[PDB]
Design a protein around this nucleic acid. Structure first.
Lengths: 86, 95, 107, 93, 583, 93, 107, 82, 98
DNA sequence: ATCGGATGTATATATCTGACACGTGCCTGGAGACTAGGGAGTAATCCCCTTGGCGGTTAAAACGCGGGGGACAGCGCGTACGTGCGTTTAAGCGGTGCTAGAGCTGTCTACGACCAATTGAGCGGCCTCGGCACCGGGATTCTCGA
DNA sequence: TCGAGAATCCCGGTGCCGAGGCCGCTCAATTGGTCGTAGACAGCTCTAGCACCGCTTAAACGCACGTACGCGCTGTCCCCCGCGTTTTAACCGCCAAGGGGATTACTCCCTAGTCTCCAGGCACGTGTCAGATATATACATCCGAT
């Protein structure tokens, strides 16, 4: 029963990684300021999704978030994901 | 030393090839849980679920950077910039 | 009194029975016509045939005998009408089409 | 508890198009979730059709229409031809 | 000249060796000579040259220096290393860890050799899933060992565990795997930390380009790879020519390994047992079939009109690959059925159509070799088309599959006359002493694989001759490669000479070999710058009685008219051949 | 044939918030189509919930959840409070 | 045996009866819980209250006593959470929020 | 009935007006074709779906409800027509 | 010397005019002739309720408008004040409409 | 200029291992077969709404055009960003161990479906007066040359 | 910078038509009843998620270094905006006439609902082989120097 306080984990997304994603996208030359912008966007997005998933969960009276929960959340927001079951 | 900007154009041809996940697990997981605490506390995640969030995430930022790149090119700059992204999320209507 | 399966009677690979169950137990209407489950299973068979065909080809062109998600991604996105159809779909382990804007290239 | 899927069916179809090709498990899970998806769409359209015209019963003709809405371009013409043929042979036997 | 530089290296090289604890004097400074095999070694006794080679290896690390052993296949190298070890356990009182490394298949042979000869020692093996290695590994981590036996692989997979622990002596086998220091192992062994002393073997040291002597030799001592480009001295020098590559190498052949006499060793079977009865060395010429002439001679334009020159562009031309794209076969037949001009197109196939039947009458069991696996297809279809009993072994022939193929072929009565291979593809180790006829194909980059193909047959116990026809077509790119590997044959022959004066550590021998090959270069160079059933029967005649049954074959095929080589007009086969050759 | 609508209901609500304000016909037709819309959404969510959990019966608790999905921000908290109160008084009388 | 309406029993302005009919006859599930139609009608009442309130205010600020579509448009779009909700809605006769990008202005 | 070049019926003045309502300041002369292109496409899609609904109902008329269901189909929800 | 406004001012009066009122900006009869002309392709001999045509117009204008909004955002992003075909093409590309 | 080093590249090896394929057995969901009846289908009659034709009114589109402000292209510069090498740390992975909590199952029981009867609210007709369009006229303000 | 003229708002008057308030009045509400069953709830098992350790090691990071690009300016050129006058084509009002929907009552058969009765699909298995990686052999590319 650890006391759980997590802070600045958003730093866990790292300039190297974001840089990689950029590469996969086809970005050529990044600007140094992006690295905060992305963390902003991402954090938002997961806020929405994790929100919906958690909601589904509590509705089912489960303490666990199954993958199906997520897939229904993404499906809810109009991003359909395949491969995790349905 | 290579002409700066060439090493990138090798990286792109590298990453647009393969499928692997570009974000370290443990950091990303710690992130997801940290967000989760706000809404409800003391939650369980199936590993596969976390995998899902990562999949959708990366698969989102990627498209974002694609479109952004289209904007920056439209501006006759080769370097994406925060105002570029902001334009993108504005056009799509994501916020 | 020897039973033949409907999926056979039309010569289909999809389980017309199972479809005709899902329509009912899914509350998509009050009553399910008889021709419908057939006519639907046919369509599904056709589409799945399309995807699997394309991914098969591309997979062969990577010199692989066993289809993996990347192959599906490339099969869909490279084709048009599918991409039109799946446009908001996200395929885990999908990767991206190889693409670079021309002006990025050196000259 | 037995879950269900289309995996076997998909696999048959595969062996009809490419007799030689294996299909990895995950890459099956996709095609599964896919088919369930397209099914939910087409059914959904059949519903919200039969609701408007105040029919109470999904029939073939609806499913035809619904397909003509969802499938873009040529997938319309081909798919419709398919189903048409299928039901035809079905009744005729 | 550079000899004095070599002498300054007499001092300083062995200075570095002093840090890692003529040259001949200072390399042999410690001489301990024991002329019998040790006690604990059981199950027989080595030959004079064998115990003298043992004694030699002893002398190596008496002075505490690594080395190489070039001995020919089947001269007892295995038992030799055994004896060396054993001597190091007993007479040297060392015991301690010893790291031995083999190719997989051979590891069986090795285990056997530790069963017969030295039961006295723990021999740790590896195989069979991580499971067996849980037991065995943790067993070793205990400090439990005498000999530790393994393959190339589990050096990489176990490199953690094995590298982590201290060692005494390092025995590499098939060492020419070290040929390229870029090879993962070569550098991993440096990541592997170290056994105190490292040791190598080879059947044949390799290409006169000689990073090989670099890679190996350098890997023999850290001193040596510090000395790499002080090898680039005479590796640049040795690689006009009489006054350059000869009057210099009237020694420099020596002078390189006149330096390297002490820690490199070799022998030849003709030197020791010399019981190899005989075999013949022959070649033939062939014609490029007109179909394979027409647009394929022009593939210089097809280079742009498609893959890559050396293989899909080139070797296809050579009769090697008729219609691999197969649309040419379609131009002949869609149904892929038996008829002429499908097989005729190639000197290989048609040529065999000519020559083989005579052998089918004279019942001489034939060997056949390749590199590209796929030829074996049309080769089969050809043989079946003649209804010939044959066996092939691909790269997909599994180990026990291989044993079966052998014993069936090596069965005394086996009525399969021809046996098909692709040389390096399945070569490994093998013994076929039941086959009296060897025939070679295509490019075969480097000869040493060809020497493999030969060693497959004439190995001791082969009581016939061995006929050899290396199959070449006239006016053909294969001739280029052929001659290239032939000049390789020369200079690596000079290398054999290295293994000669170095082999027996004598003088009149070493100069006899000097004059030998320095004459060979003269003759060969002087030589440097149709089917005729009579001629063929002649090159096939081991007696005029073979000229008897072969010329009764020429009584029939005298009257009988032999489905020949050239394919000569079929326009849209020409323009369409330009299509597909351009596609 | 009598069509139906919420027009009267809407109008009552209006006279509760702004006793004095007329509402033009077209501007009623909007609020009508609106309410039908929000209804179709919330119902739809109730369905595709009860389907997953394998309940066969839409109950209050679902409708609550569905609302918590669709309504953004504070409309969640307020609306939920509303309905909660409503059902409460309902049962209690 | 004197009937009272459910919409009254909860004190609602929307016809809880009519809702409870639409749920059934719409095939949104097999069975309709009792609390549901209530709990839904409440929500609808609340939202409609929100829109009509705002449009009322803005309409008054145009010095009009009678709400017209333009007022609805401005009420929605000016508010946030509604705009979030209605974002893909199009209101006929709606017009547009007054807006100009700053840089267009002369200086 | 043969109708041709009615797409000209959308006129530089009108498109200009729409631009204004959008907040466009200064048009470029080439837009006037671009817009006709876009518009023509859009109505192709919508009229398509509407007609489909109609024929399904075996009516010779396209009611407004038909359209509203077409727009709703394409993800553009329209209010006020039913 | 007759009086004339600074070019670009009359526009900035027009904007403030049109963003005010709600009226429909396309002439009926042309737009109707258009719609019918398109309709002929799919089926022929069709009837339209006037209100339906009204719908198509509503959605149309209410679409192009948003389009020009976003486009304008792009052109401004380019430090130009004048929208251009490539701008629109960018917009329809970003949204994913085509 | 060569040219050197890192990158693909066409055929071939040797093996390693985990993941796919074929399987044997088992169970229930699907097929066969019959019955009831209600949704569906089809004549039959009615009329509301679309379409065509019209003759006017004029607002609005079309066309011309001088001119000017934006596009656009150049560019000197300075600087933030690519690269890379040397040092550090936290991810990856294999392991151990515990148990909160997922998931299933047997009873229960409140409770929603169905129905018949009752009855009042909600919807079509049907007026009306006022909110609001619209016009004209002065008041103000807002741009554009000083 | 004030001054002029066009733009636009204000106010008061006018005239109309639909927002809305009532009135019947059909029928979909609500009451008031059983009854079959979804699902709550103990209640049980086991599994999958959490915690923690110790370990290689591939990253991440810090950093110095240089140059490619973002950018600010400028000046040249011109394409679009602000206002004529011209032409027409929409608009509005009006009509008629007819098809296409809508309604209406009638027949009938396709689906639901049960009831048995299997074999098709699912779950666990133990195997072979496709990818994985390292090796062998050439040549060709590329690129960032010369």
């Amino acid at each position: 029963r650890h006391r759980k306080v997590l802070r600045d984990n958003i730093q866990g997304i790292t300039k190297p990684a974001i840089r990689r994603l950029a590469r996969r996208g086809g970005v050529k030359r990044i600007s140094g300021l992006i690295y905060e912008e992305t963390r902003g966007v991402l954090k938002v997005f997961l806020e929405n999704v994790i929100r919906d998933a958690v909601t589904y969960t509590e509705h089912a009276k489960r303490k666990t978030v199954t993958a199906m929960d997520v897939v229904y959340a993404l499906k809810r927001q109009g991003r359909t994901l395949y491969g995790f079951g349905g | 030393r290579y002409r700066p900007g060439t090493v990138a154009l090798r990286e792109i041809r590298r990453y647009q090839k393969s499928t692997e996940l570009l974000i370290r697990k443990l950091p990303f997981q710690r992130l997801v849980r940290e967000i989760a605490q706000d809404f409800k506390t003391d939650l369980r995640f199936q590993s596969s679920a976390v995998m899902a969030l990562q999949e959708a995430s990366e698969a989102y930022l990627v498209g974002l950077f694609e479109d952004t790149n289209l904007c920056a090119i439209h501006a006759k700059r080769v370097t994406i910039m925060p105002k570029d992204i902001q334009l993108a999320r504005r056009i799509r209507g994501e916020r | 009194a020897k039973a033949k399966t409907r999926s056979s009677r039309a010569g289909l690979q999809f389980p017309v029975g199972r479809v005709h169950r899902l329509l009912r137990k899914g509350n998509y209407a009050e009553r399910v016509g008889a021709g419908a489950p057939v006519y639907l299973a046919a369509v599904l068979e056709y589409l799945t045939a399309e995807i699997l065909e394309l991914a098969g080809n591309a997979a062969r062109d990577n010199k692989k005998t066993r289809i993996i998600p990347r192959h599906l991604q490339l099969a869909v996105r490279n084709d048009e009408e599918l991409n039109k159809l799946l446009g908001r779909v996200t395929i885990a382990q999908g990767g991206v089409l190889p693409n670079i804007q021309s002006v990025l290239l050196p000259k | 508890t037995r879950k269900e899927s289309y995996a076997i069916y998909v696999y048959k179809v595969l062996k009809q198009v490419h007799p030689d090709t294996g299909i990895s498990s995950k890459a099956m899970s996709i095609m599964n979730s896919f088919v369930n998806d397209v099914f939910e769409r087409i059914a959904g359209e059949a519903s919200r059709l039969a609701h408007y015209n105040k029919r109470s019963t999904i029939t073939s003709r609806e499913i035809q229409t619904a397909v003509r809405l969802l499938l873009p371009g040529e997938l319309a013409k081909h798919a419709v031809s398919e189903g048409t043929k299928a039901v035809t042979k079905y009744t005729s036997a | 000249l550079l000899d004095q530089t070599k002498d300054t290296r007499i001092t300083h090289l062995l200075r570095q060796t002093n840090a890692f604890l003529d040259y001949y004097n200072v390399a042999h400074r410690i001489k301990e000579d024991i002329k019998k095999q040790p006690s604990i070694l059981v199950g027989g006794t080595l030959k004079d040259y064998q115990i003298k080679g043992l004694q030699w290896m002893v002398s190596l690390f008496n002075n505490h220096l690594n080395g190489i052993l070039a001995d020919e296949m089947g001269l007892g190298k295995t038992i030799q290393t055994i004896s060396l070890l054993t001597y190091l356990y007993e007479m040297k009182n060392i015991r301690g860890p010893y790291l031995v490394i083999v190719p997989l298949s051979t590891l069986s042979n090795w285990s056997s050799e530790f069963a017969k000869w030295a039961p006295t020692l723990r021999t740790i093996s590896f195989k069979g899933s991580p499971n067996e290695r849980k037991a065995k590994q943790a067993k070793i981590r205990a400090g439990e060992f005498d000999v530790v036996l393994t393959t190339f692989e589990y050096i990489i997979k176990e490199r953690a565990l094995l590298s982590k622990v201290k060692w005494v002596h390092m025995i590499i086998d098939e060492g020419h795997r070290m040929k390229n220091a870029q090879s993962k192992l070569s550098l991993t062994l440096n990541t592997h930390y170290h056994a105190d002393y490292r040791l190598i073997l080879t059947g044949t040291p390799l290409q006169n380009n000689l990073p090989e002597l670099w890679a190996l030799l350098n890997f023999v001592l850290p001193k040596i790879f510090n000395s790499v480009k002080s090898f680039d001295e005479w590796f640049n020098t040795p690689f006009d020519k009489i006054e350059l590559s000869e009057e210099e190498t009237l020694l420099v052949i020596r002078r390189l390994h006149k330096v390297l006499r002490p820690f490199l060793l070799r022998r030849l079977k003709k030197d020791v047992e010399k019981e190899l009865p005989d075999k013949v060395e022959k070649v033939v010429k062939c014609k490029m079939s007109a179909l394979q002439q027409i647009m394929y001679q022009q593939m210089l334009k097809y280079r742009r009109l498609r893959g890559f020159n050396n293989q899909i562009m080139q070797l296809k031309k050579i009769c090697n690959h008729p219609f691999v794209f197969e649309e040419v076969e379609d131009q002949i037949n869609p149904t892929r059925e038996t008829n002429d001009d499908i097989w005729r197109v190639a000197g290989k196939f048609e040529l065999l159509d000519r020559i083989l039947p005579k052998l089918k009458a004279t019942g001489h069991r034939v060997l056949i070799f390749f590199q590209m696996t796929q030829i074996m297809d049309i080769m089969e279809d050809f043989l079946r088309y003649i209804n010939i009993k044959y066996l092939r072994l691909d790269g997909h022939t599994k180990s026990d599959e291989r044993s079966e193929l052998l014993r069936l072929f090596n069965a005394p009565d086996s009525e399969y006359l021809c046996f098909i291979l692709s040389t390096r593809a399945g070569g490994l180790g093998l013994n076929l002493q039941t086959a009296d006829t060897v025939i070679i194909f295509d490019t075969d980059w480097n000869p040493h694989q060809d020497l493999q193909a030969q060693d497959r047959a004439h190995r001791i116990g082969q009581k016939n001759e061995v006929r050899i026809l290396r199959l070449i077509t006239t006016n053909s790119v294969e001739e280029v490669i052929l001659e290239r590997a032939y000049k390789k044959l020369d200079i690596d022959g000079k290398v054999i000479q290295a293994g000669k004066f170095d082999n027996k550590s004598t003088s009149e021998e070493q100069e006899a070999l000097l004059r030998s090959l320095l004459d060979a270069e003269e003759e060969r160079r002087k030589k440097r710058e149709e089917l005729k059933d009579s001629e063929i029967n002649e090159i096939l005649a081991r007696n005029d009685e073979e000229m008897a049954v072969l010329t009764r074959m020429d009584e029939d095929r005298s009257k009988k008219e032999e489905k020949s080589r050239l394919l000569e007009k079929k326009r849209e086969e020409s323009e369409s051949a330009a299509v597909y050759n351009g596609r």
